[PDB]
RNA sequence: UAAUUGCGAUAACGAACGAGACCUUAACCUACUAAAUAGUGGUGCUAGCAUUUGCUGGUUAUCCACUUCUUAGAGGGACUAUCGGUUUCAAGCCGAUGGAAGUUUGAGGCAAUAACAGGUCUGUGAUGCCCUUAGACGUUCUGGGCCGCACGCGCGCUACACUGACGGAGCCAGCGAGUCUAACCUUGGCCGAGAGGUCUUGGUAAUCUUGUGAAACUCCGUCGUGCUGGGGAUAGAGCAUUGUAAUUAUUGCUCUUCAACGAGGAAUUCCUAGUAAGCGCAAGUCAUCAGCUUGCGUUGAUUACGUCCCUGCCCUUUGUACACACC
């Protein structure tokens, strides 16, 4: 074969998974390239992992990312922690540990839950109310 | 480059697809255009009065093109919407089936889609082929 | 869409059907204040009538009013589907009408002063002032009369 | 019958639009009974001798 | 206008019977050597920056 | 044939919630004392060997303001 | 709030108090001692008593403390 | 700027902007400093971001609300009034408008001049109900500096808000408005007001 | 009805004579010029864009921004 | 997870309290290559009250 | 301390119920066991565009391989850890660091003793007593009524628009449920503006409906502050569906009619993080009917991290002629 990791990346349901193999530098999701992604006003949020750590590095590897689940801001976060956290598996397993280290240390060192998936989930409505603490209404009298 | 439709910012290629089917002719719009509401969910029919016909024939082009096959019932799943009770809560429900449908068969005549096994259509040969080509020119537009 | 200019073509304020429509109003949504056709029948029409819809209502020629009079009070010889129209089988003759302007009043009238004279309970319902499309009375409605 | 309904005045909503309301549609609970509860009515109370036999 | 600037350096407790002004003594910083004790309204930590607008004059019990 | 059906003895009836409310059920509708019906059951109990066991009787007896009675022995827990 | 409960300080103290001969200041291993040791339904509970056992450890190291 | 590119291209000045300086929008990030003492340490800016959007939590603890990035302080307090409780892309879009506005008008970056409305009408003193028995009266108070931002944003803000209900401008220039006039106090701005009012209250009453 | 719902010549004019000197120009600001309805106020900005004055500086829809030619 | 919905209440009275019953359906399938007599061996025998097997053969 | 939760003082010492433990669910696992009812990589087979290798799909089994994602079994994992502030250097609490997660990890299930004349004889073929039992207060059948309208009150739903309505277009969830002695969930193909009709089909179900292509929302237009194209009440007319039956109009559809409401007095409810609120589903009910509820995910703020002022309740001290216990 070749030299290849895949990885993923979780926001609230969203699962976003991301197969990253060695090749001539290409970066699509689900099907098609990084400069959509629309949303758009948060282009910059799946933008930035590849300008964090400059924007070569990527000139020897082939990333494409699939989403399921979620909402869309769900899936925008959930890529861009997929894409990172695979970068990262790369250096881990093909490349050397100081640069695995390296690209963590520049990732972390500004971050937005990156590598780290962010645990924040629903919570249960109960019964008396239209909410998870909402209770409904009362008049007393 | 090489380039299929993934390739094209989805509003770039349905406007373009849209004007090119307008600059064409052959069609087939059966003719109650103008009159029609396209849903029971809407208010008033189209803004575009004259083409939108071209613009849902391209949106359904397009989105028929990405996967393997699909009906009528998808496309009036997929252009349902938010119909206002009045002052009851907002559902939703689906659009039309005859404007749909006849979208179908008229890109189904112009060679575009077919009526694949499984049931629902699916992209032609020589619908990918246009639908490639007229990307390659969107995207050739902002060389 | 266009800079445009004219010079004293276009008249604002303007009557026709026994009611006036301001001519500094879109077409479509000025001749929608005649009590008998709303803003589909109007587009629909407008549309029919062969008119640009970006016009604004005292923007028109002549002829193009007269023609839009037309095609309203004559829907189904103009081609419109009859379920276009308000007043499908009158009830009488049977023929489909659009009951316009001065007339839809008297035509509310009519049924109504059908309906009593059958002495049905919606006659009795709409001689008695009250809710008739048969909704819970007890708590809406305290003002109204 | 339908007749007399649409004949008969004394009918329709300007006729009770007229008339005035009484004063027992805003009121209260009227209770009657309350704070007599723990107290019973039945005066007649249970024995000693029979509630030592029961239990 | 003669506005004041003193760091906080001690938090003492809060005032009010509704329990919103956080009693706290501050030292200035422009002429240091003197300390005041004020009362606040906001969030307050140690090391933070008042704005006083009252050279001399302090305060103690809320009601 | 498609049931088939099969008598069993339960091994310590001293054990077994259900047999001992049909026991001071029938103890009492043999007209035994209340409190001896109650208090045999929870001793019967216990000498099988229980952990611990209780006997609550809600209603009324010969009186007529209905009451209630606990009558427990040994170790029981309640939450869990 | 982290009050430990009563049986937890309880064991904790039999605990340090008949097998200081052995653990340290070390949770890992004073669980894991635990679980040679003592018979605890619950790994919860183990891992509670353990690290009290452990706060302990470190703060007899220091100077004795009541029991 | 040294350009990298490979297979799915990445756009120039976007390649540029980008690895360079890691700016807002497209605005200045650096220079910048809160124009007053205090604020600094409650005013963010830097560590820099691209658009005021985030996966931030700032309520599990009680002061780390003052370690958001302060433009970001600015577009949530947007989202309300009801009819726009949450929707923060809205909310992010009409905030890059406004900066736009901003700093088309007078120049400036437009995040300074954000950092100028912020701290200006922030209140540097106020008053509070003070009992005494029935009768209450009214004390002054030297207000924190966290509050004093969270006031500033929530007058600054709101004023706009209502500033910007049955008229034909937009949130975006209304607001553009009042962190213009709040650039440095014009006093017909709405903030500035009800902060020199409550200054106003706060030395009368004492 | 209240005025600002046409193209009385002069008022072109006036538009013409008018852009310069406008640091800020969109459709809240073209209004505010005691002139223009939205329509033919968001017509103005798109023919005046055609040739002069204006610089497109922003994009889209609800928000429109542009500033002064040099 | 069959769920069941409802007012813990006999009557009507009292603050709306709702309780969620549940019983759990769990179902598993082993996939055997074999003859006649091992197949209907292994079906006569392991019983178990509670569960339930179902012995398909098949292949459409 | 959330805790009769602990520490400590100490004529008390050592316990047991209850709290805690425990159970359930959401969080972590490139570690184990695996899988055409889950999915990935390669290969066949094949379309399009590039053509220089490539980029983007098709092919319920053409083979081979795998288990990161999905699923559920056994395990591991947190014990407020490590350091440091602060306090009787005690319990603990605060802060930094690390970490899937450090507010009882988040949310629930259970939950002692005692009380109320709280509610339920309109759930029970649970039941004492009383009343009724053939011109019946039994039962069944027809029709009507619980919906009746000067008005008072409570839960709500929709709104007063420009962070908006409209029309195009982009396009994304999670909890569910579905037909045997039956007609339930229904893709797909035609017909109709629509609602719906019709011709077939898969699914007793991780396999089919269904990726439930949901809605707020994103994008490009149109309107331009005017009771306006905001708002949709009232109402006339016509088409359909459920059903033996729809009139007092079950519901759905299309045209027209175009109300009040220009942010709302005194008062008053709910809420501290993926919570509030905004948004739509699914389920219950159900032949037909959600402006209700039970759950669910989507978008996602502001302000505390405090106190005893209003209120509500606990706890000691004290009084008592109460103990059927201030009714």
Known sequence: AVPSVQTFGKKKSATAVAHVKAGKGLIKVNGSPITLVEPEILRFKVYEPLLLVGLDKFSNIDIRVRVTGGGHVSQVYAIRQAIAKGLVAYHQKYVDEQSKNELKKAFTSYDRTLLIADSRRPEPKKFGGKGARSRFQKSYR | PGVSVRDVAAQDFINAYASFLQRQGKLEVPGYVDIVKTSSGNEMPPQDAEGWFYKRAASVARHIYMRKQVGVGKLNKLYGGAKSRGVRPYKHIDASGSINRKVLQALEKIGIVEISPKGGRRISENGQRDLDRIAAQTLEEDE | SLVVQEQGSFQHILRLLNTNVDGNIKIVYALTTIKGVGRRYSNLVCKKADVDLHKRAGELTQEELERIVQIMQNPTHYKIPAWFLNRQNDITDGKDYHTLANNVESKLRDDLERLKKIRAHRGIRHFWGLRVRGQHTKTTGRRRA | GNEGAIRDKTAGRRNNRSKDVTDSATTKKSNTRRATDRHSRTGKTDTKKKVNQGW | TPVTLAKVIKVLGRTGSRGGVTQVRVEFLEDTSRTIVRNVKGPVRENDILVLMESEREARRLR | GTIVLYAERVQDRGLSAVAQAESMKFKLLNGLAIRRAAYGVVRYVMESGAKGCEVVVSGKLRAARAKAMKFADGFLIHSG | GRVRTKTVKRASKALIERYYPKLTLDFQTNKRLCDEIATIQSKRLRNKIAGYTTHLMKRIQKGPVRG | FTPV?????????????????????????????????????????????????????????????????????????????????????????????????????????????????????????????????????????????????????????????????????????????????????????????????????????? | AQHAVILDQEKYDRILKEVPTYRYVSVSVLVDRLKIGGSLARIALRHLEKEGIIKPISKHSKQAIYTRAT | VLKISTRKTPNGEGSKTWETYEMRIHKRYIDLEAPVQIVKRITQITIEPGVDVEVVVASN
């Open chain 8, 5 to 206: 590119v490979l297979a799915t291209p990445i756009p120039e000045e976007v390649q540029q902007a980008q690895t360079e300086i890691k700016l807002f929008n497209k605005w200045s990030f650096e220079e910048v400093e809160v124009k007053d003492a205090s604020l600094v340490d409650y005013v963010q800016v830097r560590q820099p971001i691209f658009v005021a959007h985030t996966a931030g939590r700032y309520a599990n603890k009680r002061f780390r609300k003052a370690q958001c990035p302060i433009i970001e302080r600015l577009t949530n307090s947007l989202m309300m009034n009801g009819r726009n409780n949450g929707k923060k892309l809205k909310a992010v879009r009409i905030i890059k408008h406004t900066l736009d506005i901003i700093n088309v008008l007078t120049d400036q970056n437009p995040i300074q001049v954000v950092v100028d409305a912020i701290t200006n009408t922030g209140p540097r003193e106020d008053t509070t109900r003070v009992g005494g028995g029935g009768a209450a009266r009214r004390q002054a108070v030297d207000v924190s500096p966290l509050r004093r931002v969270n006031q500033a944003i929530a007058l600054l803000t709101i004023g706009a808000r209502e500033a910007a209900f049955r008229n034909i401008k937009t949130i975006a220039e209304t607001l553009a408005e009042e962190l213009i006039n709040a650039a440095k106090g014009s006093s017909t701005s709405y903030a500035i007001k009800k902060k020199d009012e409550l200054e106003r209250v706060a030395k009368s009453n004492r």
